[PDB]
Amino acid sequence: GIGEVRDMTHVYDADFPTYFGAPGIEAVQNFNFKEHGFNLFTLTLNEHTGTHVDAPLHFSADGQSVDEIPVGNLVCPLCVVHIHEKAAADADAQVTPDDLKAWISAHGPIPDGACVAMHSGWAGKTGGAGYRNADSEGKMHFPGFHVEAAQMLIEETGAVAMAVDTLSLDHGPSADFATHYAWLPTNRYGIENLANLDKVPASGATLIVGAPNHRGGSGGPARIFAMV
Amino acid sequence: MAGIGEVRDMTHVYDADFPTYFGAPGIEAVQNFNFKEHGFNLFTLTLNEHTGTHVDAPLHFSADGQSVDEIPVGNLVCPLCVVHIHEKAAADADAQVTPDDLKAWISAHGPIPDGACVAMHSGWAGKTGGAGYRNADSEGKMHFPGFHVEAAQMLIEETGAVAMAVDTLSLDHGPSADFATHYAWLPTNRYGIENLANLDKVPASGATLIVGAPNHRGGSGGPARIFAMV
Ligand SMILES: [Zn+2]
Ligand SMILES: [Zn+2]
Ligand SMILES: [Zn+2]
Ligand SMILES: [Zn+2]
Ligand SMILES: [Zn+2]
């Protein structure tokens, strides 16, 4: 139980690459130690920036908010799908139904209430302008999940969370977000911008999703751990 | 993983109508995009750091102390040491954890040292649905339990606890005006948890408190998501 834990959260700020490209959080120093003797900031946060959780409400009219997700869905068995070999050749590589099929043939079945995370070797560009990989028309290019592989995780497993080391569940050039409309409305939640997936084993680890709980929220940054 | 049965959430659901030390809405949400007119829901949160179940970073009461992002991940996973002072707080709403309360816990459950979180269970978490959480008098001074500054001095001198937890608005009790415990614990690169919940559902010892503290760059605090296991 008290084994070795791993941090899976990025350290985000104003320079952190957001989906919209613009900064997603600003700080105002309300009090400083010099004139007041204590420090306090008043933040303005775009809850869908940084290492954050995509609640079902993000893509639904009456889904589950961040506070309504049960605790049983915040402690997930970790199933990391390595596609970084495929992502090296194709920047728009997606976790296809064939990708997770090979995960069974080396680690066994997917446990119930588990989180499926994509390992595309992409959680290392957050320090530069290459994380979004915006094109000449503002079209971002980064790996993601396929909608058909998303629905594959609905019919034949008890997976509850979909995690990605990129900015979105669907890949960059997704003007429709078919993976989002498939995995979120079914009361399953998503995780984006997951860090340090190269430091956890593909199977056996247990994810600890410290999802926020501001009532009525569609998302929000979450401190995520991984008990290896 | 051995003996892992269940995990309990030690976090309150915070909104604009949540009790704060100052007594104002500590968060103002605004839904920018809606599902019907835009296809998806997205809120913009303008919030204070010390709202709901949050963590006071060392920088909260120091000059160059650690910020929320500078707290080591190892210092976030800590053995949980819960001292129950609910019987005392039932009368005086300002009962503090005396150093003798710590010693009685040592003779009962053993030593605190080795990265331990010293949590205080005063039975105040159930008062969030009313004005008893702050318990402010007719004059305006709040009357809630806290940590005795002498107990914080014993934890640094005699133990190796890297964090401590309360179930109200501050580590100091209600009538504190200079915030003694904040000044005697945070500057030493030791963080505190405020507005914790569900401490009545965890054992007094043998539990592991996983603190999901935020890591926004350069912050003195922020709402967190806390859990307890084995
Ligand atoms: Zn999102
Ligand atoms: Zn690999
Ligand atoms: Zn998303
Ligand atoms: Zn505070
Ligand atoms: Zn007791």
d(CA B3, CA A227): 15
Residues 70-89 in B contacting A (C-alpha not used; CB under 8 Å): 73-74, 76-77
Identify the helix (H) or strand (E) that includes residue B191. Answer: strand B191-194
Closest CB to A218: pick one of B12, B42, B60.
B42
Residues of B in contact with A169 (CB under 8 A): none
Which of A7, A213, A227 would you mutate first to test chain B, the one with the most B CBs within 10 A? A213
d(CA B92, CA B71): 35
d(CA B164, CA B151): 11
Closest CA to B173 of B94, B61, B99: B94
Binary contact (B227, A59; C-beta < 8 A): no
Closest CB to A1: pick one of B45, B212, B229.
B229
Residues of B in contact with A180 (CB under 8 A): 40
Q: Any catalytic annotation for residue B60?
A: yes
> From the CA of B168, how far away is ligand 4's center (Å)?
10
Task: Pick out the residues of the known binding site of A.
Answer: 48, 52, 54, 82, 84, 180, 192
Residue A161 within any structural domain of the chain: yes
Closest CB to B7: pick one of A71, A211, A223.
A71
Closest CB to A212: pick one of B59, B219, B225.
B225
What residues form DSSP beta bridges with A115? Answer: A78, A161
Binary contact (B227, A208; C-beta < 8 A): yes
Binary contact (A75, B7; C-beta < 8 A): yes
Contact A208, B21 (CB under 8 A): no
Q: Is B50 annotated as a binding residue?
A: yes
A81 in the Ramachandran plot: left (φ > 0), alpha (ψ -120 to 50) or beta?
beta
Residue B2 within any structural domain of the chain: no
Q: Is the C-alpha dihedral spanning A226, A227, B5, B7 positive or negative?
A: negative
Contact A123, A194 (CB under 8 A): yes
Distance from CA of B91 to the nearest CA of A (A): 32
Binary contact (B41, A58; C-beta < 8 A): yes
User: Quick check: helix, strand or coil at residue B216?
Assistant: coil
Residue A88 within any structural domain of the chain: yes
- Locate A25 and state its tokens: 């959080």
Instruction: Compute how many other C-beta atoms are within 10 angstroms of the C-beta atom of residue A97.
Output: 14
Residue A78 within any structural domain of the chain: yes
Residues 27-66 in B contacting A (C-alpha not used; CB under 8 Å): 27, 29, 35-36, 39-50, 52, 59-63
Range of the domain at A140: 5-10+48-227
User: Quick check: helix, strand or coil at residue B166?
Assistant: coil
d(CA B62, CA B8): 32
Contact A195, A125 (CB under 8 A): no
A124 in the Ramachandran plot: left (φ > 0), alpha (ψ -120 to 50) or beta?
alpha
Which of A5, A45, A48, A194 would you mutate first to test chain B, the one with the most B CBs within 10 A? A45
Ligand lying nearest the CA atom of residue A119: 2
Contact B208, B229 (CB under 8 A): yes
Residue B172 within any structural domain of the chain: yes
Distance from CA of A1 to the nearest CA of B (A): 4
Contact A179, A130 (CB under 8 A): no
Looking up tokens 């998303």 gives A150
Instruction: Compute how many other C-beta atoms are within 10 angstroms of the C-beta atom of residue A92.
Output: 14
d(CA B159, CA B99): 12
- CATH code of the domain containing B36: 3.50.30.50
d(CA B215, CA B69): 4
Residues of B in contact with A36 (CB under 8 A): none
d(CA B210, CA A207): 12
Residue A168 within any structural domain of the chain: yes
Binary contact (B224, A216; C-beta < 8 A): no
Distance from CA of B29 to the nearest CA of A (A): 8
Residues 184-213 in B contacting A (C-alpha not used; CB under 8 Å): 208, 210-213
Ligand lying nearest the CA atom of residue A219: 1
Domain tally for chain A?
1
Which of B60, B121, B148, B173 is labelled catalytic? B60
Contact A158, A113 (CB under 8 A): yes
| Contacts within 8 Å (CB) and 24+ apart, A173-179 | A173/A92, A173/A139, A173/A140, A173/A141, A174/A144, A177/A59, A177/B40, A178/A147, A178/A150, A179/A144, A179/A145, A179/A146, A179/A147, A179/A150
Listed in sequence order, the DSSP H helices in chain B are 35-38, 86-89, 99-109, 149-158, 180-185
Residue A119 within any structural domain of the chain: yes
Closest CB to B212: pick one of A33, A206, A223.
A223
Q: How far from chain centre, in Å, is Cα B164?
A: 7
Ligand lying nearest the CA atom of residue A198: 2
Which residues of A does the annotation mark as catalytic? 58
A168 touching chain B per CB within 8 A: no
Q: Is the C-alpha dihedral spanning A11, A33, B24, B188 positive or negative?
A: positive
d(CA B89, CA A198): 48
- Three-state helix/strand/coil letters over chain A: CCCCEEECCCCCCCCCCCCCCCCCEEEEEEECCCCCCCCEEEEEEECCCCCEEECHHHHCCCCCCCCCCCHHHCEEEEEEEECHHHHHHCCCCEECHHHHHHHHHHHCCCCCCCEEEEECCCCCCCCCCCCCCECCCCCECCCEECHHHHHHHHHCCCCCEEEECCCCCECCCCCCCHHHHHHCCCCCEEEECCCCHHHCCCEEEEEEEECCCECCCCCCECEEEEEC
Binary contact (B210, A213; C-beta < 8 A): no
Residues in CB range of A10: below 8 A, 6 or more apart: A16, A50, A51, A123, A126, A193, A195, B215
d(CA B133, CA B138): 15
Residues in CB range of A79: below 8 A, 6 or more apart: A103, A107, A110, A111, A114, A115, A116, A117, A159, A202, A203
